[PDB]
Design a binder for this molecule. Structure first.
Ligand SMILES: [Mg+2]
Ligand SMILES: [Mg+2]
Ligand SMILES: [Mg+2]
Ligand SMILES: [Mg+2]
Ligand SMILES: [Mg+2]
Ligand SMILES: [Mg+2]
Ligand SMILES: [Mg+2]
Ligand SMILES: [Mg+2]
Ligand SMILES: [Mg+2]
Ligand SMILES: [Mg+2]
Ligand SMILES: [Mg+2]
Ligand SMILES: [Mg+2]
Ligand SMILES: [Mg+2]
Ligand SMILES: [Mg+2]
Ligand SMILES: [Mg+2]
Ligand SMILES: [Mg+2]
Ligand SMILES: [Mg+2]
Ligand SMILES: [Mg+2]
Ligand SMILES: [Mg+2]
Ligand SMILES: [Mg+2]
Ligand SMILES: [Mg+2]
Ligand SMILES: [Mg+2]
Ligand SMILES: [Mg+2]
Ligand SMILES: [Mg+2]
Ligand SMILES: [Mg+2]
Ligand SMILES: [Mg+2]
Ligand SMILES: [Mg+2]
Ligand SMILES: [Mg+2]
Ligand SMILES: [Mg+2]
Ligand SMILES: [Zn+2]
Lengths: 75, 116, 136, 177, 50, 66
RNA sequence: CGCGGGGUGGAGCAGCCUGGUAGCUCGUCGGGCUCAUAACCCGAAGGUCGUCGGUUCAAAUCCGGCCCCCGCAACCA
RNA sequence: UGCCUGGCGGCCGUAGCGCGGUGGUCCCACCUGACCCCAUGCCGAACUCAGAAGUGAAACGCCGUAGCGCCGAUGGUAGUGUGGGGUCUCCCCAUGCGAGAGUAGGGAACUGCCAGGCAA
RNA sequence: UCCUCCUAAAGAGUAACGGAGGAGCACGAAGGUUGGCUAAUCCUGGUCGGACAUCAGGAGGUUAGUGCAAUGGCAUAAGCCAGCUUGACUGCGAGCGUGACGGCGCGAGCAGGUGCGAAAGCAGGUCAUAGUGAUCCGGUGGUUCUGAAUGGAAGGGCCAUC
RNA sequence: CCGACUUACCAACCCGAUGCAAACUGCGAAUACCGGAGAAUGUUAUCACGGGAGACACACGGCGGGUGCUAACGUCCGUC
RNA sequence: UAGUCCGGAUUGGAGUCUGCAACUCGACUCCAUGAAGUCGGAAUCGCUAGUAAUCGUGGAUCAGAAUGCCACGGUGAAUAC
């Protein structure tokens, strides 16, 4: 009855904290919204957080619900 | 509650406004004394603040709880903000329906030169 | 036999039995049968070690069963080649780790309970011991 | 609003002496009045609910809100979002006119009227009675209807208990058997 | 399945068209979408075709 | 309120057969004729006749006559 | 062990594919006809849809476990 | 400069609930009324406007109380990277890392920009 | 063949006739934007009304809902209702993710033109991840690009598309 | 009909106490992996482009697991 | 032309008569209530004249207690090829 599975979507966090990225570079390839769009970081329809500016990634824990955010300090 | 329901209606436009990095004109309304102030993009301090609670504005009004009083605020904020050099701002309703005093405050600010 | 009423999934992994137990103190009763040796107790063994335990201390006294199986063990039929899937769940075991109080008794003399837990220890595979409820 | 002034002058002080309120605003006041006519039988006849929405326009003086089914339940054969009932929430000055017309001429005209119930409270301060006939009201001319369709009136107050809400409604003379 | 595919034809001079689907058995009216016609380049009221 | 959706709501003259003319707003039409108002309904005597009615000994003493 | 079908008033069978409402014949019960029975005519009742759970607004039905029955398969050395 | 109050934040349960007390000069909320702006898939509840007699009940703010929530060591234990050993379905030894729970205890927040009221 | 979880040993990936379940669509609105709103289930009371229709309040708190299986996520709501609407748009696209490759996915911003909103802004489909097949061959509309002597045409090419 | 009391019994939900989970998480390592800086060390051990390949039956031991009977010099993966 | 001023059952209350005695178990009266039933499935009965049909009365039995039985008269058909 079993024997079926999907093709791994290669999710996860591509660029980590302190890592210099470029404009448009994908920071996090996620399913839902584990990580949120902080500063200088957009959010696609795939809920994929990309970098809207040159700089470095900076994970944070702001908000009244301790939800994860991802900012970018221009470096 | 009537007060807390208003805060969630504001959150939509507050959070969207700081990512953009805009200088918002936060307008607070009340059955008496319509308030107003311009806050820097840092979200911490105000730069220009004018309302009817100031004796400089209330003493030139019939009642500090209506349209012509609200029109007196918008002109005052837009003329002292054009003193500090703050030209292009954003208008944050603070959850208030843009129709009466919150509309009159903008109309007085749009004509002064406050760009929005 | 102690068996779970409708668990979430029918079959489950083998899983290792490493570590030491948590339900170590005598809580409800005053005397216990702490398990010294690591192993796995079927629902047949727990049930069998109770009948010949609830016989030595008559209708009096109260016996607590600190263990519950909740782990299905598969068994392939005879003459069946390997593969073709997981077998059929036949019995339910309880992973017993060292220091797991198996039974607790209360309402009886200590020497009687000392002899009751000698009858039950002979029905279980794991090596046990007799422990006493300590003051904190 | 004839008996609204009756409230603002006599009823308030009448309650101030009975529970020594340290505020004039602490006195109970009836907030609103809801006229529920949850017909239900509209699954068979669509015009049945349409007629029910007409009688609320007569008993009250305003248009009713045809309510939809919150959840679909097959025990009664209804579905999610199917028009099942009609309510009228009247307040402002138009509630007092109804509140008067209710207890002055409508309540006395109730068939086999012995009295209301003093236990019909939700332990908070709200009163909820139910009428069986709709003809007890002046508007229904008896020769323009074909159903014994009655409704149930809920009276919401600003009380904090049924012990106190009973005191507010006592001043309006309410029969109360 | 039932949702067949049709062709939204521009009411302008050109024969440019946006193709799309439409449930025929449930919807009896035709589509009159105002879409951008890359030839005339304004925004023309398209109409359903096959 | 929303104009032109609610019925005609005009003041009328209501008067029961006890001289109690009471003017109130309604949606009836021109006027009204009442039967029993709240100041004339027999509720003040309603409880009296159903509660205190029983007794069989008093019934029987009108038969023994002595 | 596997594949496929079935289990519905007291009997034998439709309905299940494509969910909300279960029907036919016999038998039973009551009445009539006849000297009486059978036949014949009239009227009505009667179903936990094997069983437990789940999906759903709603399960006889759709899905799964178990029990019973039926046919097929259970092979090459 | 200090107590107050309102707005926008920082930080986001040591920061939130429960119970009790308490504030109205300002402010805030409630509140009065509704031709008109606008309004309810009915209704000035909400939204809105025009004002303001009354109130601090409600709401919100503030102070106390730990009845809860919550935070939380030291030590030990569980686990474990690397190298060895054993009665090797599991452990032990050497070195490094070191939880979770629980305990002592902490605890009913802290703070910045502006604009008013107030004693000065 | 594709999608979800576990197996999978805290980056990604990772096998078996291992364990558990789905898809071969739906929608012109269930899309866009603007404004507003926020549950399930119980408890109490109430005409027909009943374990469960509609109504009022409290408790509770997101245990609800999300077109569909599962997981991640969601009130700043992506959940619910309403007004106006077609951005379910053309030409692109720095820069990245993912694969042997074919290929798939994300994308700020630029120009034309458009919708909603007072405005900031947002919209090139839908909370996301399934709903799908390469090439060839041939059909359909457009575009003088070519068109085997020359002028046309047939037929090819390019674009859209079956 | 209303409807009170009672019971050799079973028991919803809350509360205190006690265990279990690959498909549970109000917590949470060690390692591993990604990025930056720094020294030493290594015949550049690195990446890209081009010529030529072979190889795509793997086995055993340790550790972490699925399957089997925590059976198999069993079978299938991760890593050495 | 309706379940109606049709129909009168049932039931509550208050009464009367006979009788030692009216609860089980009488008849009649007053007020109230006012259902079934809107010409009846298969099937089946009576009757040819003053009969059928319909109306009312009397008597026996009997303290009281009939729509039964026996008897009387009023109005008075249809059809028999
Ligand atoms: Mg597989
Ligand atoms: Mg997967
Ligand atoms: Mg016979
Ligand atoms: Mg207070
Ligand atoms: Mg420690
Ligand atoms: Mg082993
Ligand atoms: Mg700790
Ligand atoms: Mg493949
Ligand atoms: Mg992984
Ligand atoms: Mg949607
Ligand atoms: Mg919104
Ligand atoms: Mg009830
Ligand atoms: Mg109820
Ligand atoms: Mg939406
Ligand atoms: Mg979806
Ligand atoms: Mg081919
Ligand atoms: Mg030529
Ligand atoms: Mg804790
Ligand atoms: Mg790993
Ligand atoms: Mg590194
Ligand atoms: Mg380096
Ligand atoms: Mg090969
Ligand atoms: Mg191979
Ligand atoms: Mg192994
Ligand atoms: Mg091998
Ligand atoms: Mg291998
Ligand atoms: Mg009578
Ligand atoms: Mg009838
Ligand atoms: Mg004869
Ligand atoms: Zn009167």
């Amino acid at each position: 009855r079993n024997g079926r599975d999907s093709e791994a979507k290669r999710l996860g966090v591509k660029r980590f904290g302190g890592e210099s990225v470029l404009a448009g570079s994908i920071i996090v390839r996620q399913r839902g919204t584990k990580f949120h769009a902080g500063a200088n970081v957009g959010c696609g329809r795939d809920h994929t957080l990309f970098a809207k500016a040159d700089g470095k990634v900076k994970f944070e824990v702001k908000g009244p619900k301790n939800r994860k955010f991802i900012s970018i300090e221009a470096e | 509650d009537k007060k807390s329901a208003r805060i969630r209606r504001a959150t939509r436009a507050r959070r969207k406004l700081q990512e953009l990095g805009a200088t918002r004109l936060v307008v607070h309304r009340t059955p008496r004394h319509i308030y107003a102030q311009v806050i820097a993009p840092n979200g911490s301090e105000v730069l220009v603040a004018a309302s009817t609670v100031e004796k400089a504005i209330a003493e030139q009004l019939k009642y500090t709880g209506n349209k012509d009083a609200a029109a007196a605020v918008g002109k005052a904020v837009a003329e002292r903000a054009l003193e500090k050099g703050i030209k292009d701002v954003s208008f944050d309703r603070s959850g208030f329906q843009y129709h009466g005093r919150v509309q009159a405050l903008a109309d007085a600010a749009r004509e002064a030169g406050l760009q929005f | 036999m102690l068996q779970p009423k409708r668990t979430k999934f029918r079959k489950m992994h083998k899983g290792r039995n490493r570590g030491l137990a948590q339900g170590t103190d005598v809580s409800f009763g005053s005397f216990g049968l702490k398990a010294v040796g690591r192993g796995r107790l079927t629902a047949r063994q727990i049930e069998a070690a109770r009948r010949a335990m609830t016989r030595a201390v008559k209708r009096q006294g109260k016996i607590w069963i600190r263990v519950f199986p909740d782990k299905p063990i598969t068994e392939k039929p005879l003459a069946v080649r390997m593969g073709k899937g997981k077998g059929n769940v036949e019995y339910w075991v309880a992973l017993i780790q060292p220091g797991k109080v198996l039974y607790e008794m209360d309402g009886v003399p200590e020497e009687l309970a000392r002899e009751a837990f000698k009858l039950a220890a002979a029905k279980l595979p794991i090596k046990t011991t007799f422990v006493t409820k300590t003051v904190m | 609003a004839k008996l609204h002034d009756y409230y603002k002058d006599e009823v308030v002080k009448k309650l101030m002496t009975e529970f020594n309120y340290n505020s004039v605003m602490q006195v109970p006041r009836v907030e609103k009045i809801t006229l529920n006519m949850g017909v239900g039988e509209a699954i068979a006849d669509k015009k049945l609910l349409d007629n029910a929405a007409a009688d609320l326009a007569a008993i009250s003086g305003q248009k009713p809100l045809i309510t939809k089914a919150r959840k679909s339940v097959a025990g009664f054969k209804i579905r999610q979002g199917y028009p099942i009932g009609c309510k009228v929430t009247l307040r402002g000055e138009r509630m007092w006119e109804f509140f008067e017309r209710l207890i002055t001429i409508a309540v006395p005209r109730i068939r086999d009227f012995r009295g209301l119930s003093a236990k019909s409270f939700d332990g908070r301060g709200n009163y909820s009675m139910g009428v069986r006939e709709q003809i007890i009201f002046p508007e229904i001319d008896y020769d323009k209807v074909d159903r014994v369709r009655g409704l149930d009136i809920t009276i919401t107050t600003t009380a904090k208990s049924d012990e106190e809400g009973r005191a507010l409604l006592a001043a309006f003379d309410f029969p109360f058997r | 399945g039932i949702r067949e595919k049709i062709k939204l034809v521009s009411s302008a001079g050109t024969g440019h068209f946006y193709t799309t689907t439409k449930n025929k058995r449930t919807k009896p009216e035709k589509l009159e979408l105002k879409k951008f016609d890359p030839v005339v380049r304004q925004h023309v009221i398209y109409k359903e075709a096959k | 309120m929303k104009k032109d959706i609610h019925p005609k709501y005009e003041e009328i003259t209501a008067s029961c057969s006890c001289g109690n003319v009471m003017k109130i707003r309604s949606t009836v039409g021109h006027d009204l004729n009442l039967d029993v108002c709240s100041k004339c309904h027999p509720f003040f005597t309603g409880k009296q006749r159903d509660v205190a009615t029983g007794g069989r000994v008093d019934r029987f003493n009108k038969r023994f006559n002595i």
